[PDB]
């Protein structure tokens, strides 16, 4: 420590029992001045450890300046008394100069006293007969003044500085949680919020206010009775604090919710015409003044491309106003409800493969500051009918997982590939949102199979928009996004608990299949997707029939025109096979009535062969 | 430097330290005599401690930096040594040979004047046991923890005992000065005094003059030592009854850092009127302490620490020693009286160079010498005269000769003269007539506020604790009650102190270091009674002997001229602190005990 207060051993029970946190300010400095005489009341074994009884004289003359500043020997006192640092850095940084602005407002506060005793005392001077000594005592106090003022220019840009650096880390987190919620957006499962970026630059933006009431307060106080210097100094740190305000509130509106229907909860940005939808702004100053509402304007495609673009406007309100008593029970926020799109009547890109931008206005104003606050939501996909809600959310991935640009309504003209790396882990993350389980290392390992091939040397591979989209997946007649978001729609209404209580290994290849059911007993079965037909799951079990033989049985794949009258775990339960039930043992070793009897409720079919050779197969 | 004097000393605060001793080639002494140094610990602050009930009970004067700059002195070494610097360390250039011949037949003729009543005499050390206060600072080995302590104790006689005989057998051991100087803002000051028994030496030689009045108005004319601050005012109007010009009231800068060798060597004159063993103990204490000194002055060095210089003079003056008030205010009344000599053409400016008639010096002496006497008031350095004519304001050959320049004026300008004594400062002090309800004249003592706030925020630092912090506010509170109660302002916060520290205790001292304040408001004692009895039962110029009833009868002085003399009445941070008064007294209250009465 460079300030000098050694042996707090010696009192230590005094200090510690003291009240410094309470004497750091407050209604009356009597309490620490208090403080002061008690303390030098206590600062009243062998000589050798006594050497420091002169150390502490010391500092008893060091403290005697403090006798005029008493407040400051308490604050020294109480003061004296890692993925993400940043938010500790941040809310320090706010407390730090929130003391510093209590420190700001008692400085003015008693600036403006000594102008006016200073006027006070003027004024008997200038009503005295003699217009010569005592006028120099006058201009004495006057460069007193002169020296205070400068000190609180200095002040002033000292708080500047520090709100400076506020500004430039706030803004950052902001964005970085703007792509936390791209990601939030495509059912990546992440936990966020906009009530700890909102206390932080509400923090940031009560302050600036704050400094600019003062240099108003002190410029109207400064003249006395524009010939001081203190008129051009409040102006230009008015200009600055009105910057770094301006710069604030620019990135201070967002989209809190992005627009998304509500018949359709699990997939947002996905528009039907006539349909309304559910969009929320929000304004992150919680700064609202209490006589006059505030009113946020709706529009589409401001910068439509200048291309076969189908126009669209918006039927009913393109408003939301606030009222300030609302604005204080729930925040400045503005939730869109009962919007419809409708299109305008009057290329190679499809109807899906189109984006569109939804943007909000607002003119705010607080304590006679006015801007106009702008920002626009991720792009949209408008459809005609449902049935495109599928493929639309392929078109929402790809941007949302790929996108650098978020402006960019041409993304599908020059699509890029989507990594493995990234599209792995948003494939699970659509089963992790919209069922119980997402995708462990083996399916994922499977679907990566299914789209690149077992040969592919290239770790990471690129995957085409056409080959997720249109190109179709051998083994059946579907293109892989579709068949995959067919299964998702099947896992989710017939198959749910079963998919999340891991009864269903779900994506494993056939020939992984096989592999699996070699080196079991008979009667062991397999549930799987199945990649022939659309939409099913089919099962799969194994029988030894001859030494060399292992012939693995399965069945025609059940869709929904199957499990919407006859559930699969009735199925499984009396499967009743020309008559013992084939289906022994659940892989591993799991007995079939075990692995699903709590899903059994109190009170045909097809099959395929596939035969593996135990000998072949050892070779 | 005369070494057979000074060198026993010398060596014997070296062996105090010789550890660290050492002969330092970087000292920035340029007018005075380096003998060595060694390294001390630091002492002082920069800035006063402030006392709590005063801060709390002026709020409203926190903002005025009248009240607050005088609290801002460092007396750390670095201050010590910038006034050391700036104030100290001068040269004044010898007088002209005239010049010295006139101040020699001038003080010659005072000391007769001042001595045909009485006549010089030892003091004892009963005298000195009285006069000792509730520092005893010892410079060397042996000392003490006070002085009320070390003055009741033997072997201290003994050791004082010994200086004497050194003394009597012309060497000298223990008389040595230390210096603390003290840096303000301006009026910074130097401080010398010696340990109690070099000062109890200087007494037993020379404290006649303070203990036999020797400098009282009564037997100096002139003089006006023993007169509190109640009666300045009326000297200063009798003054003003005499024909003549103006009053003019001029100051020395730097009085003490202007007494040449010559005054010192015209001021020993008056060991030709003392007996042969006062005669030798005195010669003795001024040889040794007055014409040549050693000083030990802190200093700051490298590292941090500081080191503490020992250094030598011949030809200055002290300040804490126990006649400079008297020898000061002698030299002074020569100084104006060969002023009034140059001013009424008795002298003229071929006299600077060699006196050719020294009977005109003389003659004048004798046939108006004594009468222009009584036409000036001096206390020590500080003065007020009233000359014959205004000619007086333009007497500045002699002296400016004798290096008595004046304070915050051109060397070779006029001196400005006050035609109203109400106006004149003396004392630090100006002195208003006001009148009572009975229609009786009472002339009173009244300062700036700024400074008589100030100088009752500062505490010296032995009075940390919060009783006498309390103490001591009473104090201050009650010289105002004496002194100050014409004004609003001191007023109420006398009232409001007095009301906030409990009645049965008793004040601490220090209040001002005047010689004219008396100290009569260090008595529990009803104030109102202590105001009558100053004011009108002991007054000597108050004839109706009729008492007063109460303070609200006590007459506040003119509004106009309050505000002018840094009132705060009609202020509204003043009406808000006189409206929340009560609020204020009762929370003062509290963190001490007991106020014990309102007087409110
Ligand atoms: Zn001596
Ligand atoms: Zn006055």
Same mark, same amino acid.
């Given at each position: 420590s460079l300030l000098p207060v050694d042996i707090r051993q010696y009192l230590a029970v005094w200090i510690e029992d003291q009240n410094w946190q309470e004497a750091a300010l407050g209604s009356d400095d009597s309490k620490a001045t208090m403080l002061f005489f008690h303390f030098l009341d206590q600062l009243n074994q062998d000589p050798e450890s006594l050497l420091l009884q002169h150390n502490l004289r010391k500092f008893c003359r060091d403290i005697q300046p403090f006798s005029q500043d008493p407040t400051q020997l308490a604050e020294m006192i109480f003061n004296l008394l890692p993925v993400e640092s940043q938010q500790h850095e941040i809310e320090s940084r706010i407390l730090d100069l929130r003391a510093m602005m209590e420190k700001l407002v008692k400085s003015i506060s008693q600036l403006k006293d000594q102008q006016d005793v200073f006027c006070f005392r003027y004024k008997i001077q200038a009503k005295g007969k003699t217009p010569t000594k005592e006028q120099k005592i006058l201009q004495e106090?006057?460069?007193?003044?002169?020296?205070?003022?400068?000190?609180?220019?200095?002040?002033?840009?000292?708080?500047?500085?520090?709100? /400076?650096?506020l500004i430039e880390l706030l803004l950052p987190k902001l964005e970085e949680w703007k792509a936390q919620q791209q990601k939030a957006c495509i059912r990546a499962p992440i936990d966020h919020g906009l009530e700890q970026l909102e206390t932080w630059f509400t923090a940031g933006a009560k302050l600036l206010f704050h400094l600019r009431q003062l240099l108003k307060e002190?410029?109207?106080?400064?003249?006395?009775?524009?010939?001081?210097?203190? /008129?051009?100094?409040?102006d230009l740190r008015n200009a600055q604090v009105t910057e770094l305000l301006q710069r604030l509130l620019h990135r201070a509106f967002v989209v809190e919710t992005q627009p998304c229907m509500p018949q359709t909860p699990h997939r947002p940005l996905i528009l039907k015409t006539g349909?309304?939808? /559910?969009?929320?702004?929000?304004?992150?100053?919680?700064?609202?003044?209490?006589?006059?509402?505030?009113?946020?304007?709706?529009?589409?495609?401001?910068?439509?491309?200048?291309?076969?673009?189908?126009?669209?406007?918006?039927?009913?309100?393109?408003?939301?106003?606030?009222?300030?008593?609302?604005?204080?029970?729930?925040?400045?926020?503005?939730?869109?409800?009962?919007? /419809?799109?409708?299109?305008?009547?009057?290329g190679p890109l499809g109807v899906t493969e189109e984006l569109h931008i939804i943007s909000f206005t607002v003119k705010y104003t607080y304590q006679g500051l006015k801007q106009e606050l702008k920002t626009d939501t991720l792009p949209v996909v408008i459809i005609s009918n449902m049935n495109q809600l599928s493929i639309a959310w392929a078109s929402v991935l790809w941007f949302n997982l790929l996108s650098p640009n978020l402006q960019n309504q041409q993304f599908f003209s020059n699509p890029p590939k989507a990594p493995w790396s990234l599209l792995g882990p948003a494939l699970s993350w659509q089963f992790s949102s919209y069922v119980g389980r997402g995708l462990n290392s083996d399916q994922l390992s499977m679907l990566r199979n299914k789209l690149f091939g077992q040969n592919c040397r290239t770790?990471?591979?690129?995957?085409?928009?056409?080959?997720?989209?249109?190109?179709?997946?051998?083994?059946?007649?579907?293109?892989?996004?579709?068949?995959?978001?067919?299964?998702?729609?099947?896992?989710?209404?017939?198959?749910?608990?079963?998919?999340?209580?891991?009864?269903?290994?779900?994506?494993?290849?056939?020939?992984?299949?096989?592999?699996?059911?070699?080196?079991?007993?008979?009667?062991?079965?397999?549930?799987?997707?199945?990649?022939?037909?659309?939409?099913?799951?089919?099962?799969?079990?194994?029988?030894?029939?001859?030494?060399?033989?292992?012939?693995?049985?399965?069945?025609?794949?059940?869709?929904?025109?199957?499990?919407?009258?006859?559930?699969?775990?009735?199925?499984?339960?009396? &499967?009743?096979?020309?008559?013992?039930?084939?289906?022994?043992?659940? &892989?591993?070793?799991?007995?079939?009535?075990?692995?699903?009897?709590?899903? &059994?409720?109190?009170? &045909?079919?097809?099959?395929?062969?596939?035969?593996?050779?135990?000998?072949?197969?050892?070779? | 430097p005369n070494m057979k004097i000074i060198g026993r000393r010398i060596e014997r605060i070296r062996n105090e330290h010789a550890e660290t001793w050492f002969l330092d080639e970087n000292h920035p002494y340029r007018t005075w005599a380096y003998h060595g140094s060694y390294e001390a610990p630091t002492q002082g602050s920069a800035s006063s401690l402030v006392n709590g009930v005063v801060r709390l009970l002026s709020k409203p004067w926190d903002v005025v930096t009248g009240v607050t700059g005088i609290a801002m002195t460092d007396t750390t070494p670095y201050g010590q040594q910038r006034v050391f610097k700036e104030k100290v360390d001068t040269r004044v250039p010898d007088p002209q040979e005239g010049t010295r011949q006139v101040?020699?037949?001038?003080?010659?003729?005072?000391?007769?004047?001042?001595?045909?009543?009485?006549?010089?005499? !030892?003091?004892?050390?009963?005298?000195?046991?009285?006069?000792?206060?509730?520092?005893?600072?010892?410079?060397?080995?042996?000392?003490?923890?006070?002085?009320?302590?070390?003055?009741?104790?033997?072997?201290?006689?003994?050791?004082?005992?010994?200086?004497?005989?050194?003394?009597?057998?012309?060497?000298?051991?223990?008389? !040595?000065?230390?210096?603390?100087?003290?840096?303000?803002?301006?009026?910074?000051?130097?401080?010398?005094?010696?340990?109690?028994?070099?000062?109890?030496?200087?007494?037993?030689?020379?404290?006649?003059?303070?203990?036999?009045?020797?400098?009282?108005?009564?037997?100096?004319?002139?003089?006006?030592?023993?007169?509190?601050? +109640?009666?300045?005012?009326?000297?200063?109007?009798?003054?003003?009854?005499? #024909?003549?010009?103006?009053?003019?009231?001029?100051?020395?800068?730097?009085?003490?850092?202007?007494?040449?060798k010559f005054d010192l060597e015209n001021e020993a004159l008056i060991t030709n009127q003392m007996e042969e063993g006062?005669?030798?103990?005195?010669?003795?204490?001024?040889?040794?302490?007055?014409?040549?000194?050693? !000083?030990?002055?802190?200093? #700051?060095?490298?590292?941090?620490?500081? !080191?503490?210089?020992?250094?030598?003079? +011949?030809?200055?003056?002290?300040?804490?020693?126990?006649?400079?008030?008297?020898?000061?205010?002698?030299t002074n009344l020569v100084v104006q009286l060969i002023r009034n000599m140059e001013a009424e053409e008795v002298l003229e400016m071929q006299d600077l160079w060699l006196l050719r008639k020294p009977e005109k010096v003389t003659r004048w002496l004798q046939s108006n010498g004594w009468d222009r006497l009584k036409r000036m008031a001096v206390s020590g350095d500080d003065c007020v005269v009233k000359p014959i004519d205004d000619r007086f304001a333009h007497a500045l050959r002699f002296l400016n000769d004798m290096g008595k320049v004046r304070?915050?004026? +051109?060397?070779?300008?006029?001196?400005?003269?006050?035609?109203?004594?109400?106006?004149? #400062?003396?004392?630090?002090?100006?002195?208003?007539?006001?009148?009572?309800?009975?229609?009786?004249?009472?002339?009173?003592?009244?300062?700036? +506020?700024?400074?008589?706030?100030?100088?009752?925020?500062?505490? #010296?630092?032995?009075?940390?604790?919060?009783?006498?912090?309390?103490?001591?506010?009473?104090?201050?509170?009650?010289?105002?009650?004496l002194l100050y109660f014409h004004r609003r302002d001191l007023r109420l916060m006398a009232?409001?102190?007095?009301?906030?520290?409990?009645?049965?205790?008793?004040?601490?001292?220090?209040? =001002?270091?005047?010689?004219?304040?008396?100290?009569?408001?260090?008595?529990?004692?009803?104030?109102?009674?202590?105001?009558?009895?100053?004011?009108?039962?002991?007054?000597?110029?108050?004839?109706?002997?009729?008492?007063?009833?109460?303070?609200?009868?006590?007459?506040?002085?003119?509004?106009?001229?309050?505000?002018?003399?840094?009132?705060?009445?009609?202020?509204?941070?003043?009406?808000?602190?006189?409206?929340?008064?009560?609020? =204020?007294?009762?929370?003062?209250?509290?963190?001490?005990?007991?106020?014990?009465?309102?007087?409110?």
């Open positions: 106090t006057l460069n007193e003044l002169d020296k205070r003022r400068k000190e609180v220019l200095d002040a002033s840009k000292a708080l500047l500085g520090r709100l /400076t650096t002190l410029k109207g106080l400064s003249c006395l009775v524009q010939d001081d210097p203190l /008129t051009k100094g409040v349909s309304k939808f /559910t969009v929320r702004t929000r304004l992150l100053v919680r700064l609202q003044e209490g006589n006059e509402s505030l009113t946020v304007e709706v529009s589409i495609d401001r910068n439509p491309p200048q291309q076969g673009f189908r126009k669209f406007n918006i039927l009913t309100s393109n408003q939301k106003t606030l009222t300030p008593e609302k604005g204080q029970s729930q925040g400045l926020i503005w939730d869109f409800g009962y919007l /419809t799109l409708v299109e305008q009547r009057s770790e990471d591979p690129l995957l085409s928009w056409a080959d997720f989209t249109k190109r179709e997946s051998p083994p059946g007649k579907l293109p892989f996004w579709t068949w995959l978001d067919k299964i998702l729609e099947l896992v989710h209404d017939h198959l749910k608990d079963l998919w999340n209580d891991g009864r269903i290994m779900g994506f494993v290849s056939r020939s992984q299949e096989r592999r699996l059911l070699k080196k079991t007993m008979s009667g062991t079965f397999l549930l799987r997707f199945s990649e022939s037909s659309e939409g099913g799951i089919t099962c799969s079990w194994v029988e030894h029939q001859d030494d060399d033989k292992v012939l693995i049985y399965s069945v025609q794949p059940y869709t929904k025109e199957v499990l919407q009258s006859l559930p699969l775990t009735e199925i499984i339960r009396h &499967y009743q096979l020309l008559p013992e039930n084939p289906l022994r043992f659940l &892989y591993p070793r799991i007995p079939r009535d075990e692995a699903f009897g709590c899903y &059994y409720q109190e009170k &045909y079919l097809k099959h395929r062969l596939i035969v593996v050779s135990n000998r072949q197969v050892d070779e | 101040m020699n037949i001038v003080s010659s003729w005072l000391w007769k004047e001042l001595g045909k009543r009485k006549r010089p005499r !030892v003091c004892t050390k009963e005298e000195f046991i009285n006069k000792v206060r509730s520092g005893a600072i010892f410079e060397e080995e042996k000392e003490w923890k006070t002085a009320v302590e070390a003055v009741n104790d033997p072997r201290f006689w003994a050791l004082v005992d010994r200086e004497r005989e050194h003394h009597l057998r012309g060497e000298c051991h223990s008389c !040595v000065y230390n210096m603390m100087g003290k840096r303000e803002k301006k009026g910074s000051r130097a401080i010398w005094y010696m340990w109690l028994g070099a000062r109890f030496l200087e007494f037993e030689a020379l404290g006649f003059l303070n203990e036999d009045h020797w400098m009282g108005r009564e037997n100096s004319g002139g003089g006006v030592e023993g007169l509190g601050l +109640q009666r300045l005012g009326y000297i200063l109007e009798e003054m003003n009854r005499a #024909p003549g010009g103006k009053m003019y009231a001029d100051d020395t800068a730097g009085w003490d850092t202007r007494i040449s006062h005669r030798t103990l005195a010669l003795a204490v001024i040889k040794y302490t007055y014409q040549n000194k050693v !000083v030990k002055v802190l200093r #700051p060095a490298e590292g941090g620490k500081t !080191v503490m210089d020992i250094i030598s003079r +011949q030809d200055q003056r002290g300040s804490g020693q126990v006649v400079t008030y008297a020898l000061n205010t002698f304070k915050d004026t +051109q060397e070779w300008k006029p001196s400005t003269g006050w035609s109203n004594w109400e106006e004149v #400062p003396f004392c630090s002090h100006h002195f208003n007539k006001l009148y009572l309800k009975d229609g009786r004249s009472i002339v009173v003592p009244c300062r700036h +506020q700024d400074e008589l706030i100030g100088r009752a925020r500062v505490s #010296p630092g032995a009075g940390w604790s919060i009783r006498e912090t309390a103490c001591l506010a009473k104090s201050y509170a009650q010289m105002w009650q009232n409001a102190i007095c009301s906030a520290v409990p009645v049965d205790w008793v004040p601490t001292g220090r209040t =001002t270091w005047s010689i004219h304040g008396k100290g009569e408001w260090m008595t529990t004692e009803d104030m109102l009674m202590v105001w009558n009895r100053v004011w009108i039962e002991e007054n000597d110029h108050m004839e109706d002997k009729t008492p007063v009833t109460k303070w609200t009868d006590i007459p506040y002085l003119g509004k106009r001229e309050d505000l002018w003399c840094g009132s705060l009445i009609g202020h509204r941070p003043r009406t808000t602190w006189a409206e929340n008064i009560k609020d =204020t007294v009762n929370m003062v209250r509290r963190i001490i005990g007991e106020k014990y009465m309102d007087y409110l």
